[PDB]
Amino acid sequence: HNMKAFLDELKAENIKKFLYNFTQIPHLAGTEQNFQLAKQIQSQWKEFGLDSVELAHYDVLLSYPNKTHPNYISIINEDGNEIFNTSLFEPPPPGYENVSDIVPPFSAFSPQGMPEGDLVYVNYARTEDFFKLERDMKINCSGKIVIARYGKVFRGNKVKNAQLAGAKGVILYSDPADYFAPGVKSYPDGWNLPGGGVQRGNILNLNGAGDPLTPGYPANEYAYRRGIAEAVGLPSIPVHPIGYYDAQKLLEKMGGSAPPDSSWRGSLKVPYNVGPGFTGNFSTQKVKMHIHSTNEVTRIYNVIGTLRGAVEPDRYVILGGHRDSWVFGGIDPQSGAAVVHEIVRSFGTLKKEGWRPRRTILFASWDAEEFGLLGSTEWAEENSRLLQERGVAYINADSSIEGNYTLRVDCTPLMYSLVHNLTKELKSPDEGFEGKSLYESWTKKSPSPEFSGMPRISKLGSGNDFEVFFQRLGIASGRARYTKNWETNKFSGYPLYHSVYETYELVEKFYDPMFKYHLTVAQVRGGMVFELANSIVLPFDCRDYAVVLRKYADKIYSISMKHPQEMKTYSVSFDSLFSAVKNFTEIASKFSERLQDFDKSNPIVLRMMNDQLMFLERAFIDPLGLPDRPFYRHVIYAPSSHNKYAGESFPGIYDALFDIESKVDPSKAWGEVKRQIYVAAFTVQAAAETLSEVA
Amino acid sequence: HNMKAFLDELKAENIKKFLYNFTQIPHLAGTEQNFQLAKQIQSQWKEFGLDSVELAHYDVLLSYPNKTHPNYISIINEDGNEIFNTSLFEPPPPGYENVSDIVPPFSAFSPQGMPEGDLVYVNYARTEDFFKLERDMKINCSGKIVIARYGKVFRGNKVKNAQLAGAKGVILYSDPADYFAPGVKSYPDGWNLPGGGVQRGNILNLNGAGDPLTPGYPANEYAYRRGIAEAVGLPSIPVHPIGYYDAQKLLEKMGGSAPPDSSWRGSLKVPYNVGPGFTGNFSTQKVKMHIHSTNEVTRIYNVIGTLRGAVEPDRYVILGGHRDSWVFGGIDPQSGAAVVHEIVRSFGTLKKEGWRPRRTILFASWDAEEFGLLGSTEWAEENSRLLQERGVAYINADSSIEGNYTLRVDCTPLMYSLVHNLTKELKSPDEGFEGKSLYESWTKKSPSPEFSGMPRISKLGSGNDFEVFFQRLGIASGRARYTKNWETNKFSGYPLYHSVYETYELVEKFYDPMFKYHLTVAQVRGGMVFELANSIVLPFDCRDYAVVLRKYADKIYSISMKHPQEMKTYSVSFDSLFSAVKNFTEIASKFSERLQDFDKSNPIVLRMMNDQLMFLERAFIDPLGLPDRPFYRHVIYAPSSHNKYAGESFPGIYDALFDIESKVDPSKAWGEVKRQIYVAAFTVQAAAETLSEVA
Numbered sequence A, B: 001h002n003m004k005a006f007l008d009e010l011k012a013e014n015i016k017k018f019l020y021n022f023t024q025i026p027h028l029a030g031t032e033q034n035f036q037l038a039k040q041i042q043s044q045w046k047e048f049g050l051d052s053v054e055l056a057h058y059d060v061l062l063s064y065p066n067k068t069h070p071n072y073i074s075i076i077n078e079d080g081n082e083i084f085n086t087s088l089f090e091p092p093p094p095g096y097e098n099v100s101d102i103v104p105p106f107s108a109f110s111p112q113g114m115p116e117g118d119l120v121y122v123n124y125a126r127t128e129d130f131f132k133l134e135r136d137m138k139i140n141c142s143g144k145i146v147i148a149r150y151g152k153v154f155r156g157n158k159v160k161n162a163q164l165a166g167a168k169g170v171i172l173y174s175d176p177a178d179y180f181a182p183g184v185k186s187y188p189d190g191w192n193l194p195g196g197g198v199q200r201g202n203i204l205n206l207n208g209a210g211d212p213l214t215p216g217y218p219a220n221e222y223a224y225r226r227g228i229a230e231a232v233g234l235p236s237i238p239v240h241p242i243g244y245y246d247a248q249k250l251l252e253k254m255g256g257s258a259p260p261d262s263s264w265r266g267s268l269k270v271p272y273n274v275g276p277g278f279t280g281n282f283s284t285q286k287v288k289m290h291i292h293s294t295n296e297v298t299r300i301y302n303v304i305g306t307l308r309g310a311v312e313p314d315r316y317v318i319l320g321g322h323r324d325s326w327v328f329g330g331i332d333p334q335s336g337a338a339v340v341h342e343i344v345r346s347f348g349t350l351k352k353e354g355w356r357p358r359r360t361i362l363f364a365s366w367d368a369e370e371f372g373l374l375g376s377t378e379w380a381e382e383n384s385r386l387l388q389e390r391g392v393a394y395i396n397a398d399s400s401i402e403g404n405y406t407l408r409v410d411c412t413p414l415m416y417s418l419v420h421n422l423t424k425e426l427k428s429p430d431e432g433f434e435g436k437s438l439y440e441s442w443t444k445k446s447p448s449p450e451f452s453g454m455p456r457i458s459k460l461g462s463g464n465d466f467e468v469f470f471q472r473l474g475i476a477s478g479r480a481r482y483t484k485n486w487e488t489n490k491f492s493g494y495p496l497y498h499s500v501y502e503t504y505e506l507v508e509k510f511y512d513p514m515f516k517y518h519l520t521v522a523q524v525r526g527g528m529v530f531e532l533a534n535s536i537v538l539p540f541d542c543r544d545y546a547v548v549l550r551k552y553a554d555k556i557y558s559i560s561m562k563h564p565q566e567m568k569t570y571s572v573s574f575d576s577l578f579s580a581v582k583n584f585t586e587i588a589s590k591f592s593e594r595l596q597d598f599d600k601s602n603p604i605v606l607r608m609m610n611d612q613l614m615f616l617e618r619a620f621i622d623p624l625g626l627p628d629r630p631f632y633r634h635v636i637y638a639p640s641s642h643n644k645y646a647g648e649s650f651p652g653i654y655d656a657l658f659d660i661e662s663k664v665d666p667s668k669a670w671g672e673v674k675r676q677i678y679v680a681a682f683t684v685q686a687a688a689e690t691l692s693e694v695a
């Protein structure tokens, strides 16, 4: 009927209702119950109105602890073992006293083993630096259990960087210093992190992507698995998660040496000593890890709803988010799955009245995402050939909240204008903004730098299910949540990240009581999907990619100019890239201009025009992918070989330049940079020629 | 105006005329004259009617001999050198007495050097077997100049396989046994091969593809070259071409041992002895190679004509062939470039009358093709992003003749019906077929096996410029020449292959005097291009790919069943592949059925339908390419890792199974096969799902 009709049908009492139906039971990927909910969402979506809706399943390498011989850490001495055994679970949150299946905190895909040894504290594991700083104090971690605190680099590396040091095992704990909001209680009546609360998470290093055994190809029934030994990124030494009341007891007896800088202190009731083993009455004392987990090929299910387009049924607009959780999924991911759920119900409500989108809309409820985005990925490995030629845009939908302090958006420069324009025509739920545009609300609370006349839109890359569609296939995409003030709280995710206490009540009673915020994100998300899958000419605006590219070039250029001498020494130019960028900007100009003058009456032209737009995003994908990582192919946006969080764009160049100073062979060193500058340039140029007049 | 109008405008007196204008001067790729002709064809095409026409150029690693210190081989003894020095050129053919620039026979990209050593004859170099048969007679070729005869495996390997034996250098000669048509004279009044005639050719091993220095990326002005040392497939020991009058003198004094089988005899006025060095009065005698050639980064030019479509200007149909020759290019490639030339002139003639093709037609005159398909490739490396999403079909056009005995076609099963249907409505030039369809002529003279009710259509793969478009990008394509009787002459190419005597007169006076054949191929070629770039629904017919796939599976399946025991031992099934094939066939069925029922009135559907067709060919491309060769990505058709000429389809599986008997680790051995069967299957299946109902 019309955009409005759609939005207006999105009620909060439903998303609230839904969140509740999804939170009561543990839905660990592969579990006998995650499957029941799969079936549920399947059935429920057919009822709302979807045309097609089925389960996509793959046999994926998953991993769980042995219910019989539980995992834990402890301290040993003169043949004495019992000396303090770790928690065997997390104190079940309130109402969830007697609830079967809650799985004991555990690092996924950890190798079996019961290693004995001294400990060596490490600021958030090897942020590279931190372990590249054990030479400043003679420390051969080899044969020593390194304990590190979550934060900074994605935990995987923490474990891997830990292997490159010699580690015998890894103790990863959630330190208050990082995520423990100043001035709040511990979950029950908290909102913050309880001492017994542990943060689950997987330690796979699938740099690129896939099930650790089916790289490039689907984990279908007739597939050929690799074999643990030759798998993809499995850790080589045991790993286990600790709560801080529990981390303290370990860091307590910790008897090391001079803790480098003042940053290595995690604000705990103890002194942060790095040095090996314990001291004093504790000298024969040593920590022992007990991990008895097994990796199993498990069947996983993806729910895939389908709403046939009316005009361009061969063009796909995807709205997807994972359903598989770690325990209940208060926020991650149920807080998002419900929004999706309402969004479908609404489109469904609309299909029943006799309406269809211009383009086709696909809804997915990914599985195994907490185990390495397995679900979404393998389904895409499978349908590349179609997404590749039909993928229009992909909108991801995991957690919907993190705060009350405004809207958060991440997306391909193509969808900026869309986000902008849409958000302007949307009611702001924020407190103190009666009848104010969501845009107004959003802008004021987090002004986009450089041109604060508008909202801050960040980049995608690395993380949720969108990873595949964006950094591997090249499908324009974005995400949108509700977050905290970027200055009051400086830390990463929300406290209680992958913890037990991530429960329904936690949201309803501390985050979004009225569910305003959830409803908003829902309108935001909905709109995107809607516009994308229904607006005559695609909601993309190439000009923006121009604008950003320049900035990108400048930023990367100045990184290189941090060696003005070495640059002229080895003849390292940048005109090429900057050139390419230039034309892109000039080429995009004319295309945009040319986009308004054509008579939208003639389809083929419209289409031809549209495909230029659709495929532009794909134009930035280099088939050969990045260096030693083939599943990251987005020349522009893509995880940096090195620091994935503190990274930039033009990863190729960045990694090339990263720490070039101490590069042993000064010549090849710049050859590489001098090289990526080339590719980056080539790509930008080619990406541009796309928008250049066909024929 | 109409298909006919086009064909009827193709006159023989022009193609004849053209061939003459292109043959009078040496156009070695990169030469100051190959560039003049580039400019010529550029100008000439604009005049015929093309809308756009420009030069695409890249700086490519080429290679030529030193005009001052000429290359040659010879025999040495007790400090005596002069003992028989090789020919320093080929006796200039007739009228071409005083013609500057004729380049002395030479193996391209050969390393410098003047090695001394005994010789060791080898049946057509290591067909693998031949060198894998020097153990049956204690022979460490190490530090020994191996001389081998062109034939069987593509010369590159001959040289490489020669390196794996220890070779110090390589003497490659054109032996009569193989190509010397029984019952003909030596060129001048010949048609056959003169004794002094030498066959040029490059020895690069670009398995995948590209300029040996710009792999994956264009050899544009700002590119970053690799560096000889770390180049792609350069030989590591000198190589030089010999004529047989000259090969004899070397094989003459040849004093070896027991020449294995009876096949190692090249019908020369001498006994074919393998064994090291010479015998008798010749014992201190040893051959010395003198190669002083240099590899240089040379500018190359590609002429690219453009005829804007009228409806689908974003969809490309390409007609292309190389222009760069080795000396004059009697046949290869001028014999084809003229056909193209006439074809353009005709379409041009037609554009001027106020007509345009539905789809866009692109005409290319590739450069550097004799040096490693460099021209075509690098232009494609550059425009992948467009061909990838707009490439409809690519028709190659090198030599147009090889015989008088009927038509030859090679092409993606998709274009069979097109070739069939087109050829039926075409006049047959053959002698003894007055008013008979070219189809009739063609069928009768070479019946397609299995279903002889129709013409034999062979597969593409490895060779001419189409390599890129087909085995790397995945663009449906084909070729068409006029060849010899497949039974009267059993050898490979035509005598005088890459020789001097490949001259205009050679064609006009021995091959196609009236130019009937050239005109035909021209209509054949034209038609393809025409239909493809103008017929409403694409001239493709997926059903055929079904039919062929089965056959392929069967054939490969039976190769595996050559070990019924080992198969059950290691659980090696084939149901998956056969399954996939099944559905493909079933899926294609419905798509085809579904293709006739839709109302061709509604464009978008037509288009959606069309893209299914267009992209099907691309559906068979595995991004990860084949094992240790990333530029060969066509799961179905693609050079076999091992025997490139005597190879099959499903290369993955084939190579996996090839010589599995003597595979050291019997377990991993089948793991690999058990693996490719998987991928092949996956691909076939995925390739099929493409044709499955969108949305």
Ligand SMILES: *[C@@H]1O[C@H](CO)[C@@H](O[C@@H]2O[C@H](CO)[C@@H](O)[C@H](O)[C@H]2NC(C)=O)[C@H](O)[C@H]1NC(C)=O
Pocket: A066, A067, A068, A069, A292, A294
């Ligand atoms: C969970 O751990 C137990 C350890 O008791 C595993 O049992 C092993 O296998 C069988 C019993 O299934 C015993 O004969 C072995 O002695 C046990 N060895 C070990 C690992 O201690 C059990 O297999 C594990 N869970 C399962 C069934 O996979």
Ligand SMILES: *[C@@H]1O[C@H](CO)[C@@H](O[C@@H]2O[C@H](CO)[C@@H](O)[C@H](O)[C@H]2NC(C)=O)[C@H](O)[C@H]1NC(C)=O
Pocket: A183, A402, A403, A404, A405, A431, A484, A488, A510, A511, A512
């Ligand atoms: C959600 O927003 C409310 C505001 O409506 C937050 O409440 C304040 O939280 C801060 C801590 O950041 C306290 O210092 C204040 O005392 C609280 N009330 C005031 C004065 O606003 C609430 O903490 C937020 N919780 C989240 C992020 O869900």
Ligand SMILES: *[C@@H]1O[C@H](CO)[C@@H](O[C@@H]2O[C@H](CO)[C@@H](O)[C@H](O)[C@H]2NC(C)=O)[C@H](O)[C@H]1NC(C)=O
Pocket: A417, A418, A421, A538, A539, A540
């Ligand atoms: C977002 O909205 C703005 C204005 O509402 C659009 O830009 C204007 O578009 C109209 C017609 O589309 C043109 O006549 C104006 O010249 C444009 N002005 C500006 C500010 O450029 C913009 O195209 C919209 N973007 C999308 C696709 O949502």
Ligand SMILES: *[C@@H]1O[C@H](CO)[C@@H](O[C@@H]2O[C@H](CO)[C@@H](O)[C@H](O)[C@H]2NC(C)=O)[C@H](O)[C@H]1NC(C)=O
Pocket: B066, B067, B068, B069, B292, B294
């Ligand atoms: C062609 O070969 C000659 C050999 O005489 C090369 O000359 C070398 O380089 C200079 C002259 O250009 C002399 O000083 C050297 O002594 C020569 N050395 C060699 C290879 O013998 C000449 O360079 C070659 N062609 C070119 C100019 O590239």
Ligand SMILES: *[C@@H]1O[C@H](CO)[C@@H](O[C@@H]2O[C@H](CO)[C@@H](O)[C@H](O)[C@H]2NC(C)=O)[C@H](O)[C@H]1NC(C)=O
Pocket: B183, B402, B403, B404, B405, B431, B484, B488, B510, B511, B512
């Ligand atoms: C082209 O075709 C003619 C036939 O029109 C060939 O002439 C015959 O060639 C064979 C050798 O294959 C001789 O034995 C005959 O004596 C020739 N005449 C007859 C009886 O047909 C001619 O050789 C062919 N040359 C090519 C391949 O261009």
Ligand SMILES: *[C@@H]1O[C@H](CO)[C@@H](O[C@@H]2O[C@H](CO)[C@@H](O)[C@H](O)[C@H]2NC(C)=O)[C@H](O)[C@H]1NC(C)=O
Pocket: B417, B418, B421, B538, B539, B540
């Ligand atoms: C080649 O020609 C044949 C017949 O001339 C085509 O097949 C017939 O096509 C018509 C209409 O297209 C159908 O009504 C018949 O049922 C078809 N019969 C057969 C033999 O299948 C065929 O489609 C043509 N192929 C192309 C695309 O050139």
Ligand SMILES: *[C@@H]1O[C@H](CO)[C@@H](O[C@H]2O[C@H](CO)[C@@H](O)[C@H](O)[C@H]2NC(C)=O)[C@H](O)[C@H]1NC(C)=O
Pocket: A020, A021, A024, A040, A043
């Ligand atoms: C979530 O809601 C659905 C429907 O509102 C519930 O549906 C199931 O349970 C009902 C009993 O309360 C049965 O009568 C339905 O037949 C059954 N259908 C489905 C969807 O499988 C579902 O149980 C709710 N989840 C819970 C238990 O909270």
Ligand SMILES: *[C@@H]1O[C@H](CO)[C@@H](O[C@H]2O[C@H](CO)[C@@H](O)[C@H](O)[C@H]2NC(C)=O)[C@H](O)[C@H]1NC(C)=O
Pocket: B020, B021, B024, B040, B043
């Ligand atoms: C091939 O044919 C062309 C045109 O028919 C020739 O054209 C060039 O030479 C002419 C002299 O014969 C000049 O008058 C033309 O201006 C010039 N134009 C071009 C195409 O460059 C061309 O020389 C012929 N090639 C030869 C020498 O055989």
Ligand SMILES: *[C@H]1O[C@H](CO)[C@@H](O[C@H]2O[C@H](CO)[C@@H](O)[C@H](O)[C@H]2NC(C)=O)[C@H](O)[C@H]1NC(C)=O
Pocket: A097, A098, A099, A100
């Ligand atoms: C919560 O109470 C129940 C019932 O008293 C306890 O569950 C026990 O019985 C269940 C069958 O109804 C089994 O599924 C449980 O495995 C079993 N629990 C034990 C003793 O292992 C349950 O333990 C209580 N909650 C807890 C774990 O303290």
Ligand SMILES: *[C@H]1O[C@H](CO)[C@@H](O[C@H]2O[C@H](CO)[C@@H](O)[C@H](O)[C@H]2NC(C)=O)[C@H](O)[C@H]1NC(C)=O
Pocket: B097, B098, B099, B100
């Ligand atoms: C063919 O005759 C010519 C002229 O007599 C010879 O060419 C010589 O003069 C040319 C200038 O017109 C130069 O370009 C040639 O390099 C030069 N040739 C020599 C002697 O090296 C030509 O040699 C004769 N053909 C041959 C090579 O025998």
Ligand SMILES: *[C@@H]1O[C@H](CO)[C@@H](O)[C@H](O)[C@H]1NC(C)=O
Pocket: A081, A082, A083, A084, A085
């Ligand atoms: C570990 O579990 C408890 C924890 O305090 C300890 O008392 C016990 O001795 C240890 N396990 C055993 C029984 O060896």
Ligand SMILES: *[C@@H]1O[C@H](CO)[C@@H](O)[C@H](O)[C@H]1NC(C)=O
Pocket: A576, A579, A580, A583, A681, A685
């Ligand atoms: C466009 O930018 C490219 C960068 O690759 C540059 O080389 C080229 O010269 C520019 N276009 C023009 C007008 O030449």
Ligand SMILES: *[C@@H]1O[C@H](CO)[C@@H](O)[C@H](O)[C@H]1NC(C)=O
Pocket: B081, B082, B083, B084, B085
């Ligand atoms: C090689 O060239 C001729 C060929 O017979 C020979 O006579 C000569 O001695 C050799 N080169 C020289 C002059 O050393």
Ligand SMILES: *[C@@H]1O[C@H](CO)[C@@H](O)[C@H](O)[C@H]1NC(C)=O
Pocket: B576, B579, B580, B583, B681, B685
């Ligand atoms: C189609 O073929 C595939 C081969 O991958 C097979 O697994 C599948 O079962 C077939 N389709 C059906 C109807 O299941």
Ligand SMILES: [Zn+2]
Pocket: A322, A332, A333, A369, A398, A399, A464
């Ligand atoms: Zn999540």
Ligand SMILES: [Zn+2]
Pocket: A332, A370, A498
């Ligand atoms: Zn998560």
